[PDB]
Write a protein that binds this ligand. Structure first.
Ligand SMILES: N#Cc1cc(=O)[nH]c(=O)n1[C@@H]1O[C@H](COP(=O)(O)O)[C@@H](O)[C@H]1O
Ligand SMILES: N#Cc1cc(=O)[nH]c(=O)n1[C@@H]1O[C@H](COP(=O)(O)O)[C@@H](O)[C@H]1O
Lengths: 215, 215
């Protein structure tokens, strides 16, 4: 992705979301849109963004249901024009396979969320995350998400998925993660609040890119 | 809930969803609406249903993000008129507490999904589910979801949460669960396809209720 930086656009107002995304568009190639924006403004916002900004859109829907419901969520999400969807691994292989089947049908991609970035991830997800990643490899998953806030776990995840797999990583900035350290292991970093809550989101994005280029 | 039966309305067309819900409204008082319907027809469908049918609405959004994102999802979902939201416990206590805080602010309820009903739940979720349920109890959660497809696990869940907690259970019918056995432990059953894919959804609901009344 352009500059190895993905904008997490979690503003909950179409006007603010459009303003900030337009201000930082020169510095990115992909926008992650999640439920805060979609549930506030509708699924139509995905195709609006994709057209207006000519960016790729990852739907961060943390898909975490039974196989049959997962298939329906993926179908609706790709129909809305998303390029990829983020799916939890913790509910197991059949739930992940359902999403992979729809992505295959529709010519799109699945990202598998292994370990989450927030403190509570330590309770249950962290102890299963290596096995969730290995499950991903066995299912043929090629795109993964893992935590900026724990670079030793990001390293272990990269070890499991290999160098050919694509790995993106949230928790940079607001949650405490560092762009340069995270990019030792991940291919791209996700950044939300550090950019979209900044007084000057373009300046915040540019500052991040400047530290990335230096690596 | 009326007749201990909650309709899982996962049709993805407003006209079909309205038809079936109207046909079975005499047999229920609560409708579970999830992402298949919401992502196809918009969040406004929640208030439409609540008004048209005068039913309680549980938003089954399997909420499974970091605390800050969970808060935004819950806020948008209650603003849309939902009475309650279903939240995963696997991501940990901070993520669950975020949802509880918004529910407290807005006068609504959180249901904690412990163990899921599909086969893949056995991989990772089942081994954590007793601890997820105990975490719920410690956080003061009073409403829980657990699997019709494993009544021995539903029994263990009920043991952890006590008799005062409210427990609803999906996986009845299509996934293999039985209404009567599940209601030995759960307060209410969730039923989707066995009703909404039936040639006569009212007859399917009535058939289920006749077997419930007999218990
Ligand atoms: N993908 C994802 C997800 C999984 C995870 O483990 N940690 C995250 O922060 N996220 C999402 O990434 C973004 C992080 O944004 P921020 O830079 O912390 O403001 C949010 O959309 C959050 O919901
Ligand atoms: N709530 C929930 C959820 C958690 C779980 O462990 N198992 C489920 O089936 N569900 C949901 O309950 C409904 C079950 O519907 P059905 O009766 O199997 O057609 C679906 O909306 C499914 O997504």
């Amino acid at each position: 992705v352009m500059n190895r930086l993905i904008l997490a656009m979690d503003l909950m107002n179409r006007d603010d979301a459009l303003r900030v995304t337009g201000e930082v568009r020169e510095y990115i190639d992909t926008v992650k849109i999640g439920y805060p924006l979609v549930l506030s403004e509708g699924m139509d916002i995905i195709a609006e963004f994709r057209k207006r900004f000519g960016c790729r859109i990852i739907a961060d829907f943390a898909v975490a249901d039974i196989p049959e419901t997962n298939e329906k969520i993926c179908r609706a999400t790709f129909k809305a024009g998303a390029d990829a969807i983020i799916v939890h691994g913790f509910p197991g292989a059949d739930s992940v396979r359902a999403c992979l089947n729809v992505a295959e049908e529709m010519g799109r991609e699945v990202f598998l969320l292994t370990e989450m970035s927030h403190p509570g991830a330590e309770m249950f997800i962290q102890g299963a995350a290596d096995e969730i990643a290995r499950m991903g490899v066995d299912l043929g998953v090629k795109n993964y998400v893992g935590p900026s806030t724990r670079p030793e776990r990001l390293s272990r995840l990269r070890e499991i998925i290999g160098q050919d797999s694509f790995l993106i990583s949230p928790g940079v900035g607001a949650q405490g993660g560092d762009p340069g350290e995270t990019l030792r292991f991940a291919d791209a970093i996700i950044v939300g609040r550090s950019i979209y809550l900044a007084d000057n989101p373009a300046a915040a994005a540019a500052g991040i890119i400047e530290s990335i280029k230096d690596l």
